[PDB]
Design a protein around this ligand. Structure first.
Ligand SMILES: CCCCCCCCCCCCCCCCCC(=O)OC[C@H](CO[C@@H]1O[C@H](CO[C@H]2O[C@H](CO)[C@H](O)[C@H](O)[C@H]2O)[C@H](O)[C@H](O)[C@H]1O)OC(=O)CCCCCCCCCCCCCCCCC
Ligand code: CLA
Ligand code: CLA
Ligand code: CLA
Ligand code: CLA
Ligand code: CLA
Ligand SMILES: CCCCCCCCCCCCCCCCCC(=O)OC[C@H](CO[C@@H]1O[C@H](CO)[C@H](O)[C@H](O)[C@H]1O)OC(=O)CCCCCCCCCCCCCCCCC
Ligand SMILES: CCCCCCCCCCCCCCCC(=O)OC[C@H](COP(=O)(O)OC[C@@H](O)CO)OC(=O)CCCCCCCCCCCCCCC
Ligand SMILES: CCCCCCCCCCCCCCCCCC(=O)OC[C@H](CO)OC(=O)CCCCCCCCCCCCCCCCC
Ligand SMILES: CC1=C(/C=C/C(C)=C/C=C/C(C)=C/C=C/C=C(C)/C=C/C=C(C)/C=C/C2=C(C)CCCC2(C)C)C(C)(C)CCC1
Ligand SMILES: CC1=C(/C=C/C(C)=C/C=C/C(C)=C/C=C/C=C(C)/C=C/C=C(C)/C=C/C2=C(C)CCCC2(C)C)C(C)(C)CCC1
Ligand code: OEX
Ligand SMILES: [Cl-]
Ligand SMILES: [Cl-]
Ligand code: NA
Lengths: 238, 145, 37, 44, 449, 48, 187, 99, 35, 32, 30, 48
């Protein structure tokens, strides 16, 4: 569905149907892409929904492969309502830069074998350099949990116990990974975008993306896996 | 390890409030000679003037393995305060018997528990047997009379 | 509040809700008077 | 979307049916039981 | 009355002694109806006398003055009370009608005809006369259809019924073009009772409410005529037990279902039970907490769309199980809440971030009395909100009161339906008093093992 | 609809709160309250 | 004890919910519900009272020996509260975090100013009045309202500081907090 | 027998069972309170607490109950035991989020 | 997954139909008592 | 207050009304 | 094992109650 | 590689492995590979 007929639907018609998690598409646009007028743009309603969630786990024999996974969280994975700037030049160079919106979504996915992989699907603070055919960059990835999050035993970062309260004889140099560190240091991820199906009359672009970002380290206890997110994105240029 | 003695930044001896028997766990607080709270290991760690890292308490120790080793900056002060809420700090070997971590009971406590349980059970046994020996004619039969 | 012509009768109004509670107890009084025959 | 979903939770579906096959199997099962009862009522 | 030695019923079952006494049974019914109308009039006069006009009509423990106020009698645009004279008139009329009904019930109970068949064959009835019982049921069905059409007339022509969904915060709105669509009305009645829909507590507009009332009144009148001019079919005769006790049990089951259903209307509906008269429902004040904290924390300067909570889901905004944008707190369970102060703020996809940033209305901001107190907490001896609150404010929600009471009485009436259905079946079978002791059914059965 | 709430029902002539067994129950109840769902609340007043 | 009759038909002696306190060259109406507590966070505190229900609702005054003659000599009231950004409590957490939501980078607490005044009572010496909304990353009590009334009479700075959680502030403790605020008069 | 599967056949055994069940229950509870008299309590499950100590993901309703007991103790002791003189500040008392 | 809903709907409709028509099929006459 | 006095007298009039009817029927014949 | 012992004890109790229901001694004297 | 099943005294696991089952319900595999869906026929599934 395009943005014209999404605004033509009431809240009760979209409610419970899964339409609200889908990004708009472009049907009257052109695939020329390079026809887009150069200049400084301020795009709004930047949509970004995924189509696949693949997790990189490393085997202990030395080769690289991704695997398809099963989603445990329901339709909360889309990105909606973001805005930023695109300084498009005549040759095709872009300056895509997301600023603010629903630029994150906590997603839990299940690997084959039954292991839960939570991650924070973000595109926040992402800069884009490249042509219209393909432009990439880096974005900020927060931890997953705030420093006020408490574990099942009440230990935490900003607030918590930072000690094994269950037993008064275990705080030595083996629980340091679990008690003393409690790291919330943000990571970074790399996403590559592509512009397809440009619109001339009202400036509506809707291409595809492929994003690479680290998974959740829980509380810093174990290292994060890499999540590959592919899907469609949507934007309106003004 | 010795007697963990704690001092403020400007200098006054604080004392870790000892754990009572009712508490499985107790908050770690260090209070003044007069009886006013001066420092603690806070749960929220975002307020007031009682967290260890801003009060600036130092632990000195005056015993066997630690006789003049003064610690003031790191979280070892908080660790020693938490150990000091349990009484005198002692060094323990937890690898010989693969020790648990939770405190066990004394033979005194086990003896008292077993004997009090047996004492109530034998109160019931005495009541039942006294019932049976006073009421022998009706426990066996009164023959329609 | 009640209208100005009915303001003195508001204290009489304040007791009127409990009459249905009094009715079932009146039935119990009548049963006691007939000695629960 | 990353998966296929029924997407029938909510939206006030009559008797919870979202396809005609559900209403048809409900009607067919009720009609079969009614037919057995009707041709087999009154004991005999 | 009579004694136990003749009737066989003890004093604590004395109303059973008048099962077969038509005149005394009618007198008990008319006296009881007088009791109902007496409570209506007396409690209405009590609520009028204990009414403070500046406060809204829910901090005062008033439950039925909102019932009149929903009809549009003395209600201003925003929800103010204007005048209490319609409430006073309703209370006085109920009191006088209750006096008349109580006189009639007392007369028929004391000195009325003991049995109605020997002198009044139109009103005489034996419990086994299926045609007569359907005639009485048809009379009552026509009466109830006229009662529903009375509300329809009030909504359509007498300029009444208060709409919360009117712009600006509701208004007493005369209803034009009620939705008499059979598909809409019966899709309301056959849909799921869970959180996504709600079976009967789903009416979001007075147009559907009055269309359903038109349908129920016409159906009740037609069914009344049908029962007047018919006799129950042989399958109905073989399925039902035809006695006065069995009929009571059927009525008890139906009215217990109605009691549970009304409890659910009270807890969840904010259209037939306006928030300005009944206070917030369960889902609101919880949605209002998130909404007011969102607008406050964006008034300070912090953005609410890109702010995440301790769990990384959103302190103010998140996504529902379906991709709708909802409030990010623990109020994700109440994401189906529809309110007059939410819908203009709500769009097709979600909560309309741009509308939250710019198109907030001052009256929607002032609707923080919804959140502040008045969330349907309140404790049994009044006092404030949660059980750990201190003795500060005197408030319990009227929705809480007449949901809790109505669930209690609905469950009791289900229990009474069980009791009377079982005793009616045992009475029709012949062993309501016990086992015959010389031919018990068990000795005629083979042992299990 | 909740239970009886007798918190600070007993006050003296100057209005000071005299403690009560109901107040001790209130302290235990609020100690339970701050532990329940340590991470599930974003707003102060527990309504949902 | 001495024998005196019980109170029958003798009315009630206290309904205002405020009891006067006279101290060392200061006086203030304390809340009647609140009780004293011996918990000196800052050493300059001379009086401290707290709510029996929730001790976040607390009030205290400090008697700090000072050099500046009058409160105006402390500069602008903004310059004054910049000096007193220490009795709010600095964060004990130093780890990196961008996941708090609605806070500056690496921060788990914030303070927003909502009031700046120079009120006067009886002599002519001005009173610096402030309202501060302190929002902590956990969101405890929905924030805390800090009302500060500060002045210096002879050579000692007298600073009222009543605290109220935003949970209790919305319920109606605003009346008692503002009553203490307006009743703090330095005589 | 046809409702529950089992039924009483002896009034002797029926009424002796009616006598036996509450007396046995109350005697077992008395033995438990005797065990609690010396703080010999079944407070913890060691395997569960070690599992949750080395795992930030592992949570059970028992761990929730342990966390609730900690709050009961901490927020109840100060006004419960005036002899202990527990003038604990509010920041060292444990809190969840926002409540 | 739709066929699971179809199968469950068929099963529930079957058991409800058995319930309703069994109670229709002369239930008040299934008694040992004379009446 | 005079309001409370009239509330008490109305309360006593309505509370004593029922038992008055019962005792009047007890002392003035029967049929109850 | 840990969960195996719990499962074995639970299914043993279920088997005991099944045998008590179905393979019980037939009731005598009332 | 360095602590295989025969170094741990495993008796029936080699016979289970020899005919096809390699991964368990714990998400691991004896070959060190990433576990796919074990289905009903894992080590614990075969035991059950
Ligand atoms: C043998 C012999 C006979 C024995 C009989 C024993 C059985 C019953 C005895 C009576 C039972 C009730 C005893 C308590 C009566 C009472 O102290 O009376 C209690 C109150 C007290 O009166 C006033 O009650 C007020 C309560 O606040 C109310 O008004 C406030 C504003 O003023 C707020 O609006 C607040 O929300 C609202 O609740 C204030 O506290 C006033 O100060 C106070 O004077 O009176 C009332 O309401 C009266 C209550 C009217 C009936 C209500 C029935 C319950 C209905 C719905 C609730 C169902 C609940 C089910 C679960 C349980
Ligand atoms: C009242 C008498 C008594 C007392 C006070 C003690 C006290 C003590 N014994 Mg001892 N013991 C006793 C009798 C007693 N024992 C007897 C009669 C025997 C012979 C069987 C032993 C054999 C024995 C051994 C081999 C050991 C001890 C040890 C110990 C010490 C460790 C604590 C402990 O017992 O573990 C905990 C006690 C309990 C958990 C008590 C159980 C609580 C109830 C009764 C259980 C309910 C039973 C239940 C219905 C059965 C179902 C369970 C089933 C599923 C398995 C302690 C000081 C240990 C030690 O320290 O070494 C020196 C040691 O290893 N005891
Ligand atoms: C030194 C104390 C003492 C003695 C000598 C007796 C002696 C007797 N009791 Mg008695 N009783 C006692 C204490 C005692 N009791 C106590 C403390 C209680 C409360 C629990 C009871 C409750 C009791 C009841 C309810 C009954 C008797 C009965 C009887 C009589 C024979 C029944 C029998 O034992 O068959 C054999 C008993 C068994 C096979 C029991 C099975 C083993 C149990 C379940 C576990 C044993 C634990 C372990 C192996 C031993 C350690 C316990 C020790 C440390 C205390 C017998 C004369 C019966 C009676 O009145 O006679 C008609 C009867 O019904 N007693
Ligand atoms: C909704 C409540 C209600 C109602 C309407 C009735 C009605 C009736 N009951 Mg009943 N009853 C009730 C509750 C009720 N009961 C309860 C709760 C119990 C258990 C305690 C009983 C136990 C009971 C027994 C054992 C018997 C009855 C009987 C009767 C019938 C005749 C009474 C009679 O003949 O003696 C006369 C009664 C009186 C003279 C005293 C009543 C005084 C009057 C009628 C009411 C009080 C005055 C009133 C305010 C007047 C209004 C004034 C007017 C101008 C507005 C009658 C139709 C009898 C029966 O079954 O008939 C065969 C019978 O024996 N009842
Ligand atoms: C055609 C004959 C007829 C009619 C019109 C009625 C009417 C009524 N009966 Mg009644 N009844 C009848 C025959 C009839 N009955 C017979 C033969 C018996 C056996 C003796 C009974 C036994 C009986 C009992 C035991 C009771 C009633 C009660 C009632 C009232 C219940 C409605 C109510 O109070 O709620 C509210 C009313 C409404 C919602 C309707 C709104 C008002 C509308 C606008 C008026 C309708 C006018 C309409 C055009 C006229 C109807 C046409 C008619 C042919 C049906 C009602 C007015 C109950 C009662 O006593 O109530 C006081 C009750 O307990 N009846
Ligand atoms: C409109 C519904 C209705 C009607 C018309 C009847 C009618 C009748 N019932 Mg019945 N019943 C009902 C509902 C109803 N019941 C419900 C909902 C229950 C479950 C609680 C019962 C349980 C019940 C039993 C156990 C019995 C009857 C019996 C009877 C018969 C004699 C009644 C009598 O004189 O007792 C006298 C009335 C009283 C003594 C007063 C009752 C006092 C109650 C128990 C205390 C509660 C009242 C209090 C003010 C409310 C507190 C709040 C509440 C929410 C708990 C009579 C024909 C008897 C029977 O079977 O005869 C064939 C009998 O044994 N009923
Ligand atoms: C006891 C006291 C009860 C008191 C009050 C009860 C009042 C009303 C109860 C009925 C309200 C709902 C009316 C029917 C709606 C409906 O069937 O929806 C059917 C619902 C809806 O079904 C769901 O709908 C969703 C969309 O709303 C989705 O589409 C789901 O996929 C779909 O499964 O499913 C059910 O609830 C199953 C009902 C099975 C009931 C079997 C009862 C058997 C027992 C007795 C039968 C006697 C006859
Ligand atoms: C669809 C049907 C639904 C019901 C199915 C479930 C019912 C289960 C049957 C009850 C248990 C059988 C009791 C055996 C014991 C047994 O069979 O004893 C037999 C006994 C019969 O006693 P008699 O009357 O024969 O006594 C006289 C004798 O002394 C002489 O023979 O039954 C009873 O005691 C009465 C019923 C008590 C039943 C108590 C219930 C116990 C609960 C069990 C819970 C198990 C743990 C949870 C599971 C993990
Ligand atoms: C999606 C929309 C949802 C809302 C619609 C819901 C509609 C529900 C309509 C049910 C009303 C039937 C009342 C009968 C009650 C029992 C009568 C009886 O005890 O009945 C017994 C009675 C004894 O004589 O007999 C009789 O009087 C016969 C009278 C019974 C009437 C029989 C029903 C029609 C039969 C049609 C067969 C369905 C056949 C299978 C269709 C297969 C399609 C692929
Ligand atoms: C049978 C019986 C019974 C029952 C009874 C009854 C139920 C009765 C009743 C009755 C009734 C149901 C009554 C009612 C009434 C009413 C009245 C009597 C009224 C009135 C009037 C007036 C006078 C008023 C006035 C006023 C006004 C107008 C307004 C203002 C205020 C005032 C109030 C002043 C019993 C149970 C006992 C027992 C058994 C038998
Ligand atoms: C007004 C209104 C409306 C409407 C409503 C409606 C329309 C309703 C209805 C309804 C209906 C339409 C109903 C029906 C019904 C029926 C029933 C409920 C039944 C029954 C019965 C039973 C339960 C049975 C039983 C049995 C069996 C099973 C068989 C055999 C016999 C016997 C009896 C045993 C609306 C919401 C829109 C809006 C608002 C208001
Ligand atoms: O989830 Mn279980 O729970 Ca009814 O409260 Mn609010 O939310 Mn939660 O909190 Mn407390
Ligand atoms: Cl929340
Ligand atoms: Cl919890
Ligand atoms: Na929390």
């Amino acid at each position: 569905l395009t943005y014209d007929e999404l605004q033509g639907l009431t809240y009760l018609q979209v409610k419970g149907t899964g339409i609200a998690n889908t990004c708009p598409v472009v049907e009257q646009g052109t695939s020329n892409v390079r026809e887009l007028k150069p200049g400084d743009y301020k795009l709004e309603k930047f949509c970004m929904e995924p189509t696949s969630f693949t997790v990189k786990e490393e085997d202990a024999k030395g080769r690289e492969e991704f695997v398809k996974t099963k989603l445990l969280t329901r339709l909360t994975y889309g990105l909606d309502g973001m805005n930023g700037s695109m300084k498009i030049n005549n040759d095709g160079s872009v300056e895509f830069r997301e600023d603010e919106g629903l630029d994150y979504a906590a997603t839990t996915v299940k690997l084959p074998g039954g292991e839960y992989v939570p991650f924070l699907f973000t595109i926040k603070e992402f800069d884009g350099k490249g042509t219209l055919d393909s432009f990439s960059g880096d974005f900020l990835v927060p931890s997953y949990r705030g420093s006020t999050f408490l574990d099942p035993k009440g230990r935490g970062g900003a607030t918590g116990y930072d000690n094994a309260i269950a037993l008064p004889a275990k705080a030595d140099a083996d629980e340091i990974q679990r008690l003393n560190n409690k790291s919330y240091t943000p990571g970074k991820g790399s996403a590559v975008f592509s512009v397809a199906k440009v619109d001339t009359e009202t400036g509506e672009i809707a291409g595809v993306f492929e994003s690479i970002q680290p998974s959740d380290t829980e509380m810093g206890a174990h290292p994060a896996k890499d999540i590959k997110i592919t899907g469609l994105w949507y934007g309106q240029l003004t | 390890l010795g007697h963990a003695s704690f001092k403020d930044q400007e200098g006054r001896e604080l004392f870790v409030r000892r754990m009572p028997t009712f508490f499985e766990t107790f908050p770690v607080v260090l209070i003044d000679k007069d009886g006013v709270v001066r420092a603690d290991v806070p749960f929220r760690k975002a307020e007031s003037k009682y967290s260890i890292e801003q009060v600036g308490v130092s632990v000195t120790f005056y015993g066997g393995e630690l006789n003049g080793l003064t610690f003031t900056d790191p979280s070892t002060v908080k660790k020693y305060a938490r150990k000091a809420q349990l009484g005198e700090i002692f060094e323990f070997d937890r690898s010989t018997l693969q020790s648990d971590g939770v405190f066990r009971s004394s033979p005194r406590g086990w003896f008292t528990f077993g004997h009090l349980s047996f004492a109530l059970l034998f109160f019931f046994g005495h009541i039942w047997h006294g019932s049976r020996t006073i009421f022998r004619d009706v426990f066996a039969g009164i023959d329609e009379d | 509040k009640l209208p100005e012509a009915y303001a003195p009768f508001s204290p009489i109004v304040d007791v009127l809700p409990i009459i249905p509670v009094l009715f079932i107890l009146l039935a119990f009084v009548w049963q006691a008077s007939v000695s629960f025959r | 979307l990353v998966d296929d979903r029924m997407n029938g939770d909510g939206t006030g579906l009559p008797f919870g049916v979202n396809d005609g096959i559900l209403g048809w199997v409900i009607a067919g099962t009720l009609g079969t039981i009614w037919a057995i009862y009707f041709v087999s009522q009154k004991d005999l | 009355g009579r004694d136990q030695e003749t009737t066989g019923f003890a004093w604590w079952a004395g109303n059973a002694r008048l099962i077969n006494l038509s005149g005394k049974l009618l007198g008990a019914h008319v006296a009881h109806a007088g009791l109902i109308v007496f409570w209506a009039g007396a409690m209405n006069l009590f609520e009028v006398s204990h009414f403070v006009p500046e406060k809204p009509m829910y901090e005062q423990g008033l439950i039925l003055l909102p019932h009149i106020a929903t009809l549009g009698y003395g209600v201003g645009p925003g929800g103010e009370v204007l005048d209490t004279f319609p409430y006073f008139v309703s209370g006085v009329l109920h009191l006088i009608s209750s006096a008349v009904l109580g006189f009639g019930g007392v007369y028929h109970s004391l000195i009325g005809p003991e049995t109605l068949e020997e002198s009044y064959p139109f009103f005489g009835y034996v419990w086994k006369d299926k045609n007569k019982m359907t005639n009485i049921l048809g009379y009552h069905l026509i009466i109830l259809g006229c009662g529903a059409w009375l509300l329809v007339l009030k909504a359509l022509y007498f300029g009444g019924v208060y709409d919360t969904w009117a712009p600006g915060g509701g208004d007493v709105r005369i209803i034009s073009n009620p939705t008499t669509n059979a598909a809409i009305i019966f899709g309301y009645i056959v849909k799921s009772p869970f959180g996504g829909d709600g079976w009967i507590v789903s009416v979001d507009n007075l147009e559907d409410i009055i269309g359903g009332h038109i349908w129920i009144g016409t159906l009740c009148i037609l069914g009344g005529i049908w029962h007047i001019y018919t006799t129950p079919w042989p399958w109905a005769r073989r399925a039902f037990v035809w006695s006065g006790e069995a009929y009571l049990s059927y009525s008890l089951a139906a009215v217990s279902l109605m009691g549970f259903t009304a409890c659910c209307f009270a807890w969840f509906n904010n259209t037939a039970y306006p928030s300005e008269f009944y206070g917030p429902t369960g889902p609101e004040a919880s949605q209002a907490q998130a909404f007011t904290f969102l607008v406050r924390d964006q008034r300070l300067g912090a953005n609410v769309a890109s702010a995440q909570g301790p769990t990384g889901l959103g302190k103010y905004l998140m996504r529902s199980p379906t991709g709708e944008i909802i409030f990010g707190g623990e109020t994700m369970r109440f994401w189906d809440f529809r309110g007059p102060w939410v819908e203009p703020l709500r769009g097709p996809s979600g909560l309309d971030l741009v509308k939250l940033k710019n198109d907030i209305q001052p009256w929607q901001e002032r609707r923080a009395a919804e959140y502040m107190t008045h969330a349907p907490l309140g404790s049994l001896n009044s006092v404030g909100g949660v059980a750990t609150e201190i003795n500060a404010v005197n408030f319990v929600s009227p929705r809480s009161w007449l949901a809790t009471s109505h669930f209690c009485l609905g469950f009791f009436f289900f229990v009474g339906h069980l009791w009377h259905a079982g005793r009616a079946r045992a009475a029709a079978a012949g062993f309501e008093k016990g086992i015959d002791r010389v031919d018990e059914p068990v000795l005629s059965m083979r042992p299990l093992d | 609809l909740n239970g009886f709430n007798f918190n600070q029902s007993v006050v003296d002539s100057n209005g000071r709160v005299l403690n009560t067994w109901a107040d001790i129950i209130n302290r235990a109840n609020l100690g339970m309250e701050v532990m329940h769902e340590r991470n599930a609340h974003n707003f102060p007043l527990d309504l949902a | 004890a001495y024998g005196e009759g019980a109170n029958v038909f003798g009315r009630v002696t206290n309904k205002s919910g405020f009891v006067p306190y006279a101290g060392d060259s200061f006086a203030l109406l304390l809340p009647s519900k609140w009780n004293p507590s011996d918990e000196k966070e800052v050493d300059s505190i001379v009086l401290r009272y707290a709510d029996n229900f929730d001790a976040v609702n607390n009030v205290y005054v400090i008697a700090q020996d000072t050099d500046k003659s009058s409160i105006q000599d402390y500069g602008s009231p903004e310059e004054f509260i910049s000096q007193f950004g220490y009795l709010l409590g600095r964060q004990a957490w130093a780890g990196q975090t961008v996941s708090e939501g609605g806070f500056d980078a690496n921060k788990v607490s914030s303070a927003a100013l909502l009031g700046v005044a120079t009120e006067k009572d009886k002599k002519g010496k001005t009173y610096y009045k402030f309202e501060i909304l302190s929002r902590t990353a956990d969101g405890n009590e929905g924030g805390r309202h800090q009302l500060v009334k500060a002045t210096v009479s002879n050579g000692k700075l007298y600073l009222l500081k009543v605290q109220a959680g935003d949970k209790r502030w919305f319920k109606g403790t605003d009346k008692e907090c503002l009553g203490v605020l307006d009743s703090f008069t330095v005589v | 027998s046809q409702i529950f599967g089992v039924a009483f056949s002896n009034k002797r055994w029926l009424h002796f069972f009616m006598l036996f069940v509450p007396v046995t229950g109350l005697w077992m509870s008395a033995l438990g309170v005797v065990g609690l008299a010396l703080n010999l309590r079944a407070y913890d499950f060691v395997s569960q607490e070690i599992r949750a100590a080395e795992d930030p993901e592992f949570e059970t309703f028992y761990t929730k109950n342990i966390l609730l007991n900690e709050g009961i103790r901490a927020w109840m002791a100060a006004q419960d035991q005036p002899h202990e003189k527990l003038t604990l500040p509010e920041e060292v008392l444990p809190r969840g989020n926002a409540l | 997954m739709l066929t699971l809903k179809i199968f469950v709907y068929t099963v529930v409709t079957f058991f409800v139909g058995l319930f309703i028509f069994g109670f229709l099929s002369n239930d008040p006459s299934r008694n040992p008592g004379k009446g | 207050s005079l309001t409370l006095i009239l509330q008490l007298v109305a309360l006593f009039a309505v509370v004593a009304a029922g038992p008055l009817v019962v005792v009047l029927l007890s002392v003035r014949g029967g049929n109850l | 094992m840990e969960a195996l012992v719990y499962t074995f004890l639970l299914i043993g109790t279920l088997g005991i109650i099944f045998f008590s229901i179905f393979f019980r001694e037939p009731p005598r004297i009332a | 590689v360095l602590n295989p099943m025969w170094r741990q005294g495993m008796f029936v696991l080699p016979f289970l492995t020899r005919l096809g089952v390699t991964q368990s319900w714990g998400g691991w595999t004896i070959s060190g590979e990433t576990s796919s869906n074990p289905g009903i026929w894992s080590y614990e599934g075969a035991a059950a």
